[PDB]
Amino acid sequence: GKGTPSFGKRHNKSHTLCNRCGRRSFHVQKKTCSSCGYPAAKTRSYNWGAKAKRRHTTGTGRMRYLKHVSRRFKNGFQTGS
Amino acid sequence: GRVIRNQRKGAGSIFTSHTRLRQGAAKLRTLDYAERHGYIRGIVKQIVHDSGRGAPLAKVVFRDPYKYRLREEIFIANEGVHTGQFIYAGKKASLNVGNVL
Amino acid sequence: NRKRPVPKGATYGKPTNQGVNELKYQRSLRATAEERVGRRAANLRVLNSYWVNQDSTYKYFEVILVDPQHKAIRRDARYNWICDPVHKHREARGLTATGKKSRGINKGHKFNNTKAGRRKTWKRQNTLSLWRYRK
Amino acid sequence: EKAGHQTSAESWGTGRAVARIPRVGGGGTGRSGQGAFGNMCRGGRMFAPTKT
Amino acid sequence: MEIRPQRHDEKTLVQSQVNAYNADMIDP
Amino acid sequence: AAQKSFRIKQKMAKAKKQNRPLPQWIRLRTNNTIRYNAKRRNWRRTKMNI
Amino acid sequence: AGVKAYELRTKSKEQLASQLVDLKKELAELKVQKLSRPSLPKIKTVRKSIACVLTVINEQQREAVRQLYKGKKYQPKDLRAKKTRALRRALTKFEASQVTEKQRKKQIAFPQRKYAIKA
Amino acid sequence: VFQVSMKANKYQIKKAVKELYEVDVLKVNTLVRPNGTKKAYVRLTADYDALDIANRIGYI
RNA sequence: UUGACCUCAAAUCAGGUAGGAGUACCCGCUGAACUUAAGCAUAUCAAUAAGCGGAGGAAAAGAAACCAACCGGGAUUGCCU
RNA sequence: AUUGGCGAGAGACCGAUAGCGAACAAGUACAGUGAUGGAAAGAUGAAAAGAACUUUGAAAAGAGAGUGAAAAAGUACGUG
RNA sequence: CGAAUUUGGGUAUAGGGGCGAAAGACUAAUCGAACCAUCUAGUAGCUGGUUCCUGCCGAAGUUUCCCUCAGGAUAGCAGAA
RNA sequence: UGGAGGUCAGUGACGAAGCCUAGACCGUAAGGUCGGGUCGAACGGCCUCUAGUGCAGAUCUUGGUGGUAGUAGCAAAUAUUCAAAUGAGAACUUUGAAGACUGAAGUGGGGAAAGGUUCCACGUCAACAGCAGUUGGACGUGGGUUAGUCGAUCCUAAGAGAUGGGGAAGCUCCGUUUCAAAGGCCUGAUUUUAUGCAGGCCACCAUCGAAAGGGAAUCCGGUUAAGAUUCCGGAACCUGGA
RNA sequence: UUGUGACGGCCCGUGAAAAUCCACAGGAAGGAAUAGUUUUCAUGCCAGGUCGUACUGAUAACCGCAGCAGGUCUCCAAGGU
RNA sequence: UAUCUAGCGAAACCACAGCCAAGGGAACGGGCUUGGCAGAAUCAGCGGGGAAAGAAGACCCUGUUGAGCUUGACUCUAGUU
RNA sequence: AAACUUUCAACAACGGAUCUCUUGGUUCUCGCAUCGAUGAAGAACGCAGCGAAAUGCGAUACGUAAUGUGAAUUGCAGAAUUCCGUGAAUCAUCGAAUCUUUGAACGCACAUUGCGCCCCUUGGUAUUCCAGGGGGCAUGCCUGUUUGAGCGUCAUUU
């Protein structure tokens, strides 16, 4: 009975959506994210998970402030008009 | 081999004591000032069954010598102690069953 | 000593790596003392540290920290070098007196493994240099 | 240097009526269970990769 | 206009992996 | 479940709004190779796992 | 067509606020009409017009505070130079160029003399 | 019946209905729609007619 | 009685700083085993992988408690040897 | 020193089962509770001129016709 | 088949660890040590495969040594210069 | 065979490359050349250079496709039939007429978890519903979930977990009241005044953890394509507030 | 059938906590020209935000690769024999 | 049910295939040798054969390949003293 | 003689090889030094006349302002001698702004769109109640400021 009939007993989610990353990896009872490690201040990463770091590094997001710094640097961090 | 059953008890996960229905740590009152130069009287209000303990426990109410407050104490019930009885605690307490000499 | 943080002393490998107890921390007690302080007063920069006392359980040290964003140090050019970002957490990377002592940074035949840094020296003499016209 | 090796493929071993070449794990993709790492494998590493 | 991209669901390549009885063949 | 949090209800909302066929006008747009919505979802077929 | 910022910069606070209210009224009216008719691009420049009015309103308010704090240290951080955290924490030009009096008397006495070899 | 901001509450909706249509309201009833937008049912008092305000807004 | 000093404290006291990210290179700590030895335990792999702390455009090092033994060189780094 | 960032110049390199996993709405789709795993998919034509119109058929479509240098290029599109 | 009963949810215990009225059972169809990634293209005296033509020459399963006996080294046999 | 240097001032949209052709020629052969067809933009000879350079096999890789074969089969859950209507099209869709079954620990009427729009309406049948389909949990377009009283929120439960502090190189670990300087409301004052200034009681020690535990308070009648103990009409209650 | 009640049996098993609400003890304070208190009597006035609310709940709406004879907690419960 | 029909429509497996007897052969041939013979296309069955299919025998041995477990094996080790 | 395997100067299928193409990759070299408590990287939810994705953006939301260029955008529409001009544009710049919910993430909490406290307002004819608008309230440190504490101590004896 470990196969098909046991698969019908599972309806309690053990992970929910994480605040820091919206991934469904926030362990409910450990109050931790298995992906990003929330609520630890650092983000969970490993040099043995090269694909995992590539999935959420800088540039995978919007870089709403970082996309502009090079242009702001080239203009010498000016002020005015 | 694997870690054996008596080894796993020190972790205290499923081997901690079941303490929900217990009435508190059965203790004598604090040896403060009265118990060591006189005695203090108190009344046993109830004798109750303590889950997991074979012995009954006695709830005793002493007065606070320093403030206006009734201080309850959880004594282990000695045979013959009844509700409504005075028990005297201190060096000058009489040699009677229930006293705390 | 620094006890090897293994459960029940099980190292899971060759006997040469089976040691647990008589293993020595490679940094000094002065180094951990000023790294622990540097985390406490993280706004300052660790200038130095020195021994004051010791007993059976505790070695006692005094740490000198310099406030980099205090304007009395931003001026007075004898001290403002520590305000430059290249001196962030000197105690962490081993740039203090005890840090230079532990990394073995000293002149002489006695420090051949640690002159430009042990890992720098090792990577240098473990690199296969190939020129365009092969030598 | 990492072309054809950016996978965690593992051999199934014998007993499953397939070649002993490593195969991608998991499921539900199409890539799952496909040969990997071999110079004979689609998407695998070339034989004796060219070096600088 | 209600186009039909083929589903192309994948099927677990494991398939059945069971033998007869328990052994059927222990010491031929 | 009927008794859902706000966060779950908001996720239901985005998934329901995304669950549409491609607009027919964007097909005619120049240099466009989008003929259909390849991110379509049906409740029976693929679960959103939240 | 759409209001122009160079025009609005000549208008006072009460004119601009009044100009904002009836624009928000025009947008609100247009959103009602968006339901009846399929397309109405007029809603875009009304939102642009609303944005233009708010841009200039914020500009005068930010400029008003700018010379309110003028000539004294501790301007608001929102008014300060954003450039970069590390640049902001870098030593100033005056502070990085400071030297001791000992160094000063040596730099004066023996500067890097300019010369050339002839033959 | 209005589409209102997600950040609205029944006090804020009541105040806006009075400021934008000059009519006192009796009760506000709000829900979040399945499409994720807040909807409101504002009941104007008995001395008003809803289709009177509605038609001069521009819808029937 | 009234003022100090030392140490310690408190305030949404006045003004600041640290934390995270990225991490190719860099400075440290911590740290394997597969493997090779045709077995294997020292050794090797490797003072490497993985783990942790900390920087800059470079870092570290650095103007000798150096090298030498010569008719002496003269901070550090790197290349050739 | 530099397989990261930014900006450039190149090659006796690969040429869509190759080259990065990804030349394409690719770390998308999908799988797994989770760590993580992780594809396939490039080519009408010079230009859409993407087949008006007539007849068979409920319709899809067919037969004509028409456009095109070529429908032995009809989008289930170069060759095939 | 009224109890050492059956059972929902919450909670705790995590891999040489847990849990076990004990079957090496169970720990997400995985258990005499789970799963995931990485070290890792781990090593293999062993099995399988190893891609055009013609021309000329053309074997060995024997010697000695080896934890050697399904392997090597060595000599022999063979080709080429 | 791919690419490179040199050359043939080589072939080519008047047709390169590729492909098909029991057509021809050459070479022992690897192969080379050519006729015919298809085709549309590049590509060869020779002297050299270079390599990711030649397949029948590896239970090879990826992809595609056969014979098996119109075959095995599509047989549990008693059972369908008649007529009409709608439609090209009806064994299966609707309506009526029958016959039956679940037989109230239901094949009934609600919920929890989970799902997430499957709800409902309108059009609609390419694919899916292993026959069928005009039907549908399908397809396309829209509508829909209304609360002071129903829940969450509040409370504590096993238990999680900051601070004080102590370990730990360090990610962090312990610890939860501990060796911590951890506390409101009345006419105090009540006109630079709201803490400029003698008005008490303490002995509180974080916080998170139940949509089945504890809890402040709502009922009936009506209403919709779909909501209702929420909307409407009556009739109440609780909490806070001068 | 459900609820209630008064009982009786059982245990080396005696069958949560807190929030919250009230009551009591007490005797600080305050009260005489239209006033003082009763707002635990009656009546009167205003407000009560936020998030959830459709539907299935299973031989087709969940999980078992699926519209799978499996698995998945619970309330109501007519007549006859 | 099978069967026959209308629709729908797989898989295993497959070097090539498919009549025997003897022979000789890797010592039990569908093929090779010598004989017997041999006539399209087929249907329902059937279990003699295809040393039928299903799995790089789990028995046994070999490998200088493991692992679980045990001990006065060798080498260590947490703890403890 | 048919029906039932092979070859086609044969057509049609199935399938997607080959050939030719390449806004991609890979490798080499050269130059530069710039993320974040002034809130980064990352995430969630939204934003377009007609968008699901993707790009961009933040309720001023495929974007505002300033600047340059000087007539587009383009799938369909839609303000047009908007066009000899402070002026189009899915254009380039880019210094000024906006910058939702979050995140080192900061009032406390967080599987809640949960619960507070302080200041100024407005309203309900209210310092206390409620609602609305706008401001705020984290730790560890550093420097300084006030208020203190301790028979730790000095003067100083009502």
Work out the burial of residue G2: count CB atoms within 10 Å of its CB; fewer than 13 is exposed, 13-18 middle, 19 or more buried: exposed
Angstrom distance (rounded) from CA F48 to CA A13: 13
H3 three-state secondary structure: strand
Q: Are D52 and D1 spatial neighbours (Cβ–Cβ below 8 Å)?
A: no
Q: How many CB atoms lie within 10 A of CB G16?
A: 17
Find the residue closest to M47 using CA and C1' atoms.
Answer: H11
Please check whether residue G103 touches C, CB under 8 A.
Answer: yes
Touching subunits of A (3+ CB pairs, under 8 Å) are F, G
Nearest to D30 among E10, E14, E17 (CB): E10
Please name the amino acid found at residue C18: Q
Interface test with H, best of F16, F19, F20 (most H CBs within 10 A): F16
Interface of D with E (CB under 8 A): 16, 23, 27-30, 32-33
Work out the burial of residue C33: count CB atoms within 10 Å of its CB; fewer than 13 is exposed, 13-18 middle, 19 or more buried: buried
Helices (H), chain C: 29-40, 71-74, 90-93, 97-102, 118-125
Angstrom distance (rounded) from CA C90 to CA C92: 5
Q: Are C68 and C61 spatial neighbours (Cβ–Cβ below 8 Å)?
A: no
Structure tokens at G59: 């500009």
Residue identified by tokens 């003929």 is F35
SS3 content of chain D, % helix, strand, coil (to 5): 0, 10, 90
Angstrom distance (rounded) from CA A9 to CA C56: 59
* Radius of gyration from C-alpha coordinates of chain E: 20
Interface test with E, best of F24, F36, F42 (most E CBs within 10 A): F36
Report residues 12-51 of D contacting strand M, contact meaning Cβ closer than 7 Å.
28
Cβ contact (<8 Å) for H35 and F16?
yes
Task: Tell me whether residue A21 is annotated as binding.
Answer: yes
Angstrom distance (rounded) from CA A74 to CA G115: 37
The size of chain F, in residues, is: 50
The size of chain E, in residues, is: 28
Touching subunits of D (3+ CB pairs, under 8 Å) are E
Work out the burial of residue H1: count CB atoms within 10 Å of its CB; fewer than 13 is exposed, 13-18 middle, 19 or more buried: exposed
Q: Are C39 and G61 spatial neighbours (Cβ–Cβ below 8 Å)?
A: no
Report chain H residues whose CB lies below 8 A from the CB of F10: 36
Please name the amino acid found at residue B86: F
Angstrom distance (rounded) from CA G90 to CA C87: 12
G to H CB pairs, distance under 8 Å: 9
Residue identified by tokens 């282990």 is B76
Interface test with E, best of D11, D14, D16 (most E CBs within 10 A): D16
Give the bases of strand K that a protein CB approaches within 7 Å.
Answer: 8-14, 16-20, 22, 24, 26-30, 33, 36-38, 40-41
Q: Is the CB of C18 under 7 A from strand N?
A: yes
Measure the CA dihedral C103/C105/C108/C113, to 10°: 40
Report chain E residues whose CB lies below 8 A from the CB of D22: none
Q: Are strands B56-63 and B70-76 parallel, antiparallel or unpaired?
A: antiparallel
Let me know if chains G and C touch, i.e. at least 3 Cβ pairs under 8 angstroms. Answer: yes
DSSP C61: E
Report chain H residues whose CB lies below 8 A from the CB of G36: 58-59
What is the 3-class SS of G28-76, one letter each residue?
Answer: HHHHHHHHHCCCCCHHHHHHHHHHHHHHHHHHHHHHHHHCCCCCCCCCC
Indicate the resolution in Å.
2.3
Spatial strand order in the sheet of A26-27: A15-16, A26-27, A32-33
State the distance between the two ends of chain D, measured CA to CA, in whole angstroms: 10
| Cis amide leading into D49 (omega within 30) | no
In chain D, which ranges are E strands? 10-11, 22-23
Cβ contact (<8 Å) for A17 and F49?
no
Angstrom distance (rounded) from CA A37 to CA A46: 12
Nucleotide nearest to A16 (CA to C1'): O111
